[PDB]
């Protein structure tokens, strides 16, 4: 399981750029793919999505008609055909592995990310910085403008951890399920609009910016991001 | 459709892709001719497999068809508990050694006759064509120049020679069919021969043609 | 005669098992059926509000 | 002049001379109804192009009540909209039936020679119906009520004679001869295939002598089955083509409105006949 | 001399069984109000299989399904939206059994290839891979049941049953004593014992650690095709080809009651119990699945709707849905 991207760099405004990632270590054709953008001010932002089979393509309402996402399953590669780039596109782009079935984990793996430099449900996190100490128990709350509890009984709420100098990783999916590879120390709870992520003990690897995401409907919207200092 | 969340819609799309892949796999599977290969152990089953644990499967393509010959002689258990699995094969290839009329396992030839009767009159293969292979022509000729068929069949009455004895064995094997109008049986004499593949191809082509006509109600 | 000895030993082991009356175990089975009768959706159909099917 | 189609004046003893074709049509209607509905149920629960035949037979059949009412009321006392719809439906469903027979034949021959998708044959049904509807427009736009003592008739007036000479023959060709040639060639090719099968088998001692006799039997039954289908098509849809050619020839000898009706009933019998022919169970 | 001793022991066992059964279960249940007419409906129909369906098994979440067919495909069903979660191709298309792991991380399959295959469902690659290839049976695999993770119990056509360790891939215990081909398996609710049905009209109770045959049950007149435990684990029901379902008592060790009718002459492919054990569902060859009152031997319903032989049966752990698989390549969920 590895995702390596290229194509980023300095680009003149109004030009074009062609991002791509090379999939390796997993069945790329059976996975949906997302492009996630993070501005230098540390804010995640969903961009595009392509299904496992091409035919279900979504865009955020800021790049639609300007960005083109394509998938080449023989070569296990994604593509972003970006045209007429502006100064607001200066950010770092990530590719996110995604699958969708009953019990699946739709936001497991993220790419390393390349820096690009150019010369809706509202999710709010109350605290942007919580200075704490290791060994204690902390809680971080995320609030949604619209109820995320669907008629199926699921609550499409996602938590992410981004260590400094690292890519985001999934912690909690559907508000109550631990992701693969993370300990049971992390716990999540909530009801409808109010959400809370609970940590039993703080370690040196738990320092970072915690993000809050909803998957109830497109476009996917991320939270502001709560930073833990210790 | 309007009441489905995004993840449910993506799961539905995945299910539709699974459906299309199943359809493609079934289409590829329907272009292969399944063949049971039965017969006693002493019969010339090995040379028939050489014509080119559990079930042994063999691939071979003569001209425009793909064949799947399944060997079931490796399973020494009760046939009626797993014979229904093969219902729907294009034909059953039955091998009998003509040289076993004078041996014993309890005469071997009558052993094959009972096995052929059990397979042919089985309810799972009411309309399944049977390609009957009669092996060891030359050994049968050698054993018939000095010994008659009377020791095998007392009611037999004919001049001791290859042709009439082979025809008599063939007609006795064919008379075990208790549904002559609907079920049809192909019979072939083989030894150093290379015509077995052509005979199997021709028999399979008929069966396909007759099944097409029986699924059209023409005749 | 090893198979015969094994069969004799198996029969001896089977015969050395304590058995109870059929009526008592039948009453126990009946009590189990009545105890969980209210928790059987097949016996008593669930209202469609709580029925995903 | 101005040939009347289903209007024919009957005189003395007509309460019994109409009580014969009303019985003919009621019997043919009921038998076609039950035959086609049973064929429909039989095909639906067997699959779980012939569906096109049976639905087209029922559509042919539905128009019959109007013809009976016309026969009892000697003039077209129905509305001026019926004189379009009745004949358009009859010709539409008839053309659909013929084209579907040819399509069934060609499907069978191809399935057999291909030694055996959905959307292709589906668009085939759609194109059959579209063609049959499009080429029957001259039989809706051109039928008119016309007083003739001054009896109103729903005849068919044609703008220019070269519009009869060239639509009559076009309908006849592309709806009877080409479908007929298709059925002929398809079933003759099935005979060729089912005979070359036996030809190659018989060479390598595949068929014994008593084997050979039964093969001949069952393989003569097949010949009769295909011969009967071919001949049923031709001699069971040919009277109406003869009637069309007759009407054109006397628009350019002496056909009676009472001769039209019996040929039309003869063609109605196709609907009660098709379930049996294509469901020889 | 050993034959005489064996006959004497069998006669002593028969006499000890005869010195029991003061009353039958019918006499005791005569005071019980009979259950009324029971009519399930086909809530969901699962399509996608193109051949005969020989096996199914219900998940522990009462939502996920697995089905085995001669297509060479193992399909995971959602059973709520009729969505297909996984489609697992099989190297051998002659599958005869399938089992779903209680933890849900694994699935099993086996058949005429004499090999039980364990598949991994939850992998990083996102596809289903072959985890272990369990070989060692000389006959066709007829039934497999997951005791837990890393342990599988399989029965084969070579008149024996084996308990495997999936990590090592080697047999840990071999259960011998049957003379016919074993065609069924069912584990106890506590996974402590299990019973097997062979082609000799006999059923045997086995101890998982001990490997010894505790008790042997007879009474059937034909080959036993399916066995299922009672929910309490003190009884089991067996279906055979003689159109007869029999309920057996583990603590008493006699035949308890018989589920038979004159109008049924066809064999029985599968048996299953409701959550409370009051309903005994049996799949027959007459294209119908009959609902039996497990206490009064009265037919309380018929699951008509399959046009071929109903070869599969299954009840969810909450006992709320019944899924029947048949040879017409259709799965129907009843409620
Ligand atoms: C291929 C096919 C299919 C169905 C039918 C059919 C069926 C029932 C019916 F009532 C009438 C018809 C068609 O009857 C006529 C059409 C046009 C003409 C006009 C000729 C001129 O003006 O020269 C006269 C009579 C015919 C051919």
Short mmCIF file of N, CA and C in Angstrom, two decimals, chain A residues 128-225:
data_model
loop_
_atom_site.label_atom_id
_atom_site.label_comp_id
_atom_site.label_asym_id
_atom_site.label_seq_id
_atom_site.Cartn_x
_atom_site.Cartn_y
_atom_site.Cartn_z
N UNK A 128 -9.09 25.95 18.19
CA UNK A 128 -8.05 25.80 17.18
C UNK A 128 -6.70 25.41 17.78
N UNK A 129 -6.58 25.41 19.10
CA UNK A 129 -5.32 25.05 19.76
C UNK A 129 -5.62 24.70 21.20
N UNK A 130 -5.28 23.47 21.61
CA UNK A 130 -5.51 23.02 22.98
C UNK A 130 -4.18 22.58 23.58
N UNK A 131 -3.48 23.46 24.30
CA UNK A 131 -2.22 23.05 24.95
C UNK A 131 -2.49 22.16 26.15
N UNK A 132 -1.94 20.95 26.11
CA UNK A 132 -2.15 19.95 27.15
C UNK A 132 -0.81 19.30 27.48
N UNK A 133 -0.85 18.31 28.36
CA UNK A 133 0.34 17.60 28.82
C UNK A 133 0.19 16.11 28.57
N UNK A 134 1.30 15.41 28.33
CA UNK A 134 1.21 13.96 28.12
C UNK A 134 0.74 13.22 29.36
N UNK A 135 0.05 12.10 29.13
CA UNK A 135 -0.46 11.28 30.20
C UNK A 135 -1.85 11.63 30.68
N UNK A 136 -2.44 12.72 30.20
CA UNK A 136 -3.77 13.14 30.60
C UNK A 136 -4.80 12.73 29.54
N UNK A 137 -6.07 12.93 29.89
CA UNK A 137 -7.19 12.62 29.00
C UNK A 137 -7.78 13.92 28.48
N UNK A 138 -7.95 14.02 27.16
CA UNK A 138 -8.44 15.22 26.51
C UNK A 138 -9.63 14.86 25.64
N UNK A 139 -10.41 15.89 25.29
CA UNK A 139 -11.55 15.74 24.40
C UNK A 139 -11.57 16.90 23.42
N UNK A 140 -11.87 16.60 22.16
CA UNK A 140 -11.95 17.59 21.10
C UNK A 140 -13.31 17.45 20.43
N UNK A 141 -14.02 18.57 20.31
CA UNK A 141 -15.40 18.57 19.85
C UNK A 141 -15.51 19.16 18.45
N UNK A 142 -16.37 18.56 17.63
CA UNK A 142 -16.70 19.06 16.31
C UNK A 142 -18.21 19.21 16.21
N UNK A 143 -18.66 20.30 15.59
CA UNK A 143 -20.08 20.60 15.48
C UNK A 143 -20.45 20.75 14.01
N UNK A 144 -21.61 20.20 13.65
CA UNK A 144 -22.10 20.22 12.28
C UNK A 144 -23.35 21.08 12.19
N UNK A 145 -23.44 21.88 11.12
CA UNK A 145 -24.62 22.70 10.90
C UNK A 145 -25.85 21.87 10.54
N UNK A 146 -25.66 20.70 9.94
CA UNK A 146 -26.74 19.81 9.58
C UNK A 146 -26.48 18.44 10.21
N UNK A 147 -27.56 17.79 10.63
CA UNK A 147 -27.44 16.48 11.27
C UNK A 147 -26.86 15.46 10.29
N UNK A 148 -25.84 14.74 10.74
CA UNK A 148 -25.15 13.76 9.92
C UNK A 148 -25.72 12.35 10.09
N UNK A 149 -26.72 12.17 10.95
CA UNK A 149 -27.32 10.86 11.16
C UNK A 149 -28.30 10.58 10.03
N UNK A 150 -27.97 9.59 9.20
CA UNK A 150 -28.83 9.22 8.09
C UNK A 150 -29.92 8.25 8.55
N UNK A 151 -30.88 8.00 7.67
CA UNK A 151 -31.96 7.07 7.98
C UNK A 151 -31.47 5.64 8.11
N UNK A 152 -30.28 5.33 7.58
CA UNK A 152 -29.72 3.99 7.75
C UNK A 152 -29.29 3.74 9.19
N UNK A 153 -29.13 4.80 9.98
CA UNK A 153 -28.59 4.70 11.31
C UNK A 153 -27.13 5.10 11.43
N UNK A 154 -26.44 5.26 10.31
CA UNK A 154 -25.05 5.68 10.33
C UNK A 154 -24.93 7.19 10.52
N UNK A 155 -23.76 7.61 11.00
CA UNK A 155 -23.43 9.02 11.17
C UNK A 155 -22.09 9.24 10.48
N UNK A 156 -22.12 9.77 9.26
CA UNK A 156 -20.93 9.87 8.43
C UNK A 156 -19.99 10.96 8.94
N UNK A 157 -19.28 10.66 10.02
CA UNK A 157 -18.31 11.58 10.62
C UNK A 157 -16.94 10.91 10.62
N UNK A 158 -15.92 11.65 10.18
CA UNK A 158 -14.57 11.12 10.04
C UNK A 158 -13.59 11.99 10.80
N UNK A 159 -12.66 11.35 11.50
CA UNK A 159 -11.60 12.02 12.23
C UNK A 159 -10.26 11.67 11.61
N UNK A 160 -9.35 12.65 11.56
CA UNK A 160 -8.05 12.46 10.95
C UNK A 160 -6.96 13.03 11.85
N UNK A 161 -5.77 12.45 11.73
CA UNK A 161 -4.58 12.87 12.46
C UNK A 161 -3.47 13.19 11.48
N UNK A 162 -2.94 14.40 11.56
CA UNK A 162 -1.84 14.84 10.71
C UNK A 162 -0.69 15.30 11.61
N UNK A 163 0.31 14.45 11.77
CA UNK A 163 1.51 14.83 12.50
C UNK A 163 2.29 15.86 11.69
N UNK A 164 3.08 16.71 12.35
CA UNK A 164 3.90 17.68 11.62
C UNK A 164 4.87 16.99 10.68
N UNK A 165 4.93 17.48 9.44
CA UNK A 165 5.77 16.86 8.44
C UNK A 165 5.29 15.51 7.95
N UNK A 166 4.01 15.21 8.11
CA UNK A 166 3.45 13.92 7.72
C UNK A 166 2.09 14.12 7.07
N UNK A 167 1.60 13.06 6.43
CA UNK A 167 0.30 13.03 5.78
C UNK A 167 -0.79 12.65 6.77
N UNK A 168 -2.02 13.09 6.53
CA UNK A 168 -3.12 12.70 7.42
C UNK A 168 -3.42 11.21 7.35
N UNK A 169 -3.91 10.68 8.46
CA UNK A 169 -4.31 9.28 8.56
C UNK A 169 -5.67 9.20 9.23
N UNK A 170 -6.42 8.16 8.90
CA UNK A 170 -7.75 7.99 9.46
C UNK A 170 -7.67 7.45 10.89
N UNK A 171 -8.50 8.02 11.77
CA UNK A 171 -8.61 7.55 13.14
C UNK A 171 -9.97 6.93 13.41
N UNK A 172 -11.05 7.68 13.18
CA UNK A 172 -12.41 7.22 13.43
C UNK A 172 -13.23 7.44 12.16
N UNK A 173 -13.93 6.40 11.73
CA UNK A 173 -14.85 6.49 10.61
C UNK A 173 -16.25 6.11 11.06
N UNK A 174 -17.24 6.88 10.61
CA UNK A 174 -18.64 6.75 11.02
C UNK A 174 -18.80 6.92 12.53
N UNK A 175 -17.96 7.78 13.11
CA UNK A 175 -18.11 8.36 14.44
C UNK A 175 -17.87 7.36 15.57
N UNK A 176 -17.81 6.07 15.26
CA UNK A 176 -17.72 5.07 16.32
C UNK A 176 -16.77 3.91 16.03
N UNK A 177 -16.13 3.87 14.87
CA UNK A 177 -15.32 2.73 14.47
C UNK A 177 -13.86 3.14 14.39
N UNK A 178 -13.01 2.40 15.10
CA UNK A 178 -11.57 2.64 15.04
C UNK A 178 -11.01 2.18 13.70
N UNK A 179 -10.12 2.98 13.13
CA UNK A 179 -9.48 2.60 11.88
C UNK A 179 -8.46 1.50 12.12
N UNK A 180 -8.06 0.84 11.03
CA UNK A 180 -7.06 -0.22 11.13
C UNK A 180 -5.68 0.39 11.38
N UNK A 181 -4.95 -0.19 12.33
CA UNK A 181 -3.62 0.26 12.65
C UNK A 181 -3.51 1.27 13.77
N UNK A 182 -4.63 1.76 14.30
CA UNK A 182 -4.60 2.70 15.41
C UNK A 182 -5.02 1.97 16.68
N UNK A 183 -4.54 2.37 17.85
CA UNK A 183 -4.91 1.67 19.08
C UNK A 183 -6.33 2.00 19.52
N UNK A 184 -6.81 1.21 20.48
CA UNK A 184 -8.13 1.44 21.07
C UNK A 184 -8.15 2.62 22.04
N UNK A 185 -7.01 3.30 22.22
CA UNK A 185 -6.96 4.46 23.09
C UNK A 185 -7.87 5.58 22.58
N UNK A 186 -7.88 5.80 21.27
CA UNK A 186 -8.78 6.78 20.69
C UNK A 186 -10.22 6.27 20.74
N UNK A 187 -11.15 7.17 21.03
CA UNK A 187 -12.56 6.82 21.08
C UNK A 187 -13.38 7.99 20.56
N UNK A 188 -14.51 7.67 19.93
CA UNK A 188 -15.36 8.68 19.35
C UNK A 188 -16.81 8.49 19.74
N UNK A 189 -17.51 9.61 19.87
CA UNK A 189 -18.91 9.59 20.27
C UNK A 189 -19.58 10.86 19.77
N UNK A 190 -20.90 10.83 19.74
CA UNK A 190 -21.67 11.98 19.31
C UNK A 190 -23.10 11.59 19.00
N UNK A 191 -23.89 12.61 18.66
CA UNK A 191 -25.30 12.39 18.34
C UNK A 191 -25.78 13.54 17.46
N UNK A 192 -25.98 13.25 16.18
CA UNK A 192 -26.61 14.19 15.27
C UNK A 192 -25.74 15.33 14.79
N UNK A 193 -25.46 16.29 15.67
CA UNK A 193 -24.71 17.48 15.28
C UNK A 193 -23.51 17.70 16.18
N UNK A 194 -23.60 17.26 17.43
CA UNK A 194 -22.52 17.40 18.39
C UNK A 194 -21.68 16.13 18.40
N UNK A 195 -20.37 16.30 18.26
CA UNK A 195 -19.45 15.18 18.19
C UNK A 195 -18.28 15.41 19.13
N UNK A 196 -17.70 14.32 19.62
CA UNK A 196 -16.57 14.38 20.54
C UNK A 196 -15.63 13.22 20.29
N UNK A 197 -14.34 13.52 20.25
CA UNK A 197 -13.28 12.52 20.12
C UNK A 197 -12.48 12.50 21.41
N UNK A 198 -12.35 11.33 22.02
CA UNK A 198 -11.77 11.18 23.35
C UNK A 198 -10.47 10.40 23.26
N UNK A 199 -9.45 10.87 23.98
CA UNK A 199 -8.15 10.22 24.04
C UNK A 199 -7.84 9.91 25.50
N UNK A 200 -7.47 8.65 25.77
CA UNK A 200 -7.22 8.24 27.15
C UNK A 200 -5.91 8.82 27.68
N UNK A 201 -4.84 8.74 26.89
CA UNK A 201 -3.53 9.21 27.31
C UNK A 201 -2.81 9.85 26.13
N UNK A 202 -2.03 10.89 26.41
CA UNK A 202 -1.32 11.62 25.37
C UNK A 202 0.13 11.15 25.30
N UNK A 203 0.59 10.84 24.09
CA UNK A 203 1.96 10.42 23.84
C UNK A 203 2.65 11.42 22.93
N UNK A 204 3.93 11.17 22.66
CA UNK A 204 4.70 12.04 21.78
C UNK A 204 4.25 11.95 20.33
N UNK A 205 3.62 10.84 19.94
CA UNK A 205 3.14 10.66 18.58
C UNK A 205 1.72 11.17 18.37
N UNK A 206 1.05 11.63 19.43
CA UNK A 206 -0.31 12.14 19.33
C UNK A 206 -0.36 13.64 19.11
N UNK A 207 0.79 14.30 19.01
CA UNK A 207 0.83 15.75 18.80
C UNK A 207 0.59 16.03 17.32
N UNK A 208 -0.39 16.88 17.03
CA UNK A 208 -0.69 17.22 15.66
C UNK A 208 -1.99 18.01 15.57
N UNK A 209 -2.51 18.11 14.35
CA UNK A 209 -3.74 18.84 14.07
C UNK A 209 -4.82 17.81 13.76
N UNK A 210 -5.91 17.84 14.53
CA UNK A 210 -6.99 16.88 14.37
C UNK A 210 -8.06 17.50 13.48
N UNK A 211 -8.48 16.77 12.45
CA UNK A 211 -9.44 17.27 11.48
C UNK A 211 -10.76 16.52 11.59
N UNK A 212 -11.83 17.20 11.19
CA UNK A 212 -13.19 16.69 11.29
C UNK A 212 -13.85 16.76 9.91
N UNK A 213 -14.35 15.63 9.43
CA UNK A 213 -14.89 15.54 8.08
C UNK A 213 -16.25 14.86 8.11
N UNK A 214 -17.12 15.26 7.18
CA UNK A 214 -18.43 14.65 6.99
C UNK A 214 -18.49 14.01 5.61
N UNK A 215 -19.21 12.89 5.52
CA UNK A 215 -19.41 12.18 4.26
C UNK A 215 -20.89 11.95 3.97
N UNK A 216 -21.76 12.79 4.55
CA UNK A 216 -23.19 12.64 4.33
C UNK A 216 -23.57 12.96 2.89
N UNK A 217 -22.98 14.01 2.31
CA UNK A 217 -23.30 14.40 0.95
C UNK A 217 -22.14 15.19 0.37
N UNK A 218 -22.04 15.17 -0.95
CA UNK A 218 -21.03 15.95 -1.65
C UNK A 218 -21.47 17.40 -1.77
N UNK A 219 -20.53 18.36 -1.75
CA UNK A 219 -19.08 18.19 -1.61
C UNK A 219 -18.64 17.88 -0.18
N UNK A 220 -17.56 17.11 -0.05
CA UNK A 220 -17.04 16.78 1.27
C UNK A 220 -16.39 18.01 1.89
N UNK A 221 -16.74 18.31 3.14
CA UNK A 221 -16.24 19.48 3.84
C UNK A 221 -15.48 19.06 5.08
N UNK A 222 -14.30 19.64 5.26
CA UNK A 222 -13.45 19.37 6.41
C UNK A 222 -13.65 20.43 7.48
N UNK A 223 -13.18 20.12 8.68
CA UNK A 223 -13.22 21.06 9.78
C UNK A 223 -12.07 22.05 9.73
N UNK A 224 -12.10 22.98 10.68
CA UNK A 224 -11.03 23.98 10.77
C UNK A 224 -9.71 23.36 11.20
N UNK A 225 -9.76 22.38 12.10
CA UNK A 225 -8.55 21.73 12.57
C UNK A 225 -8.14 22.17 13.96
#
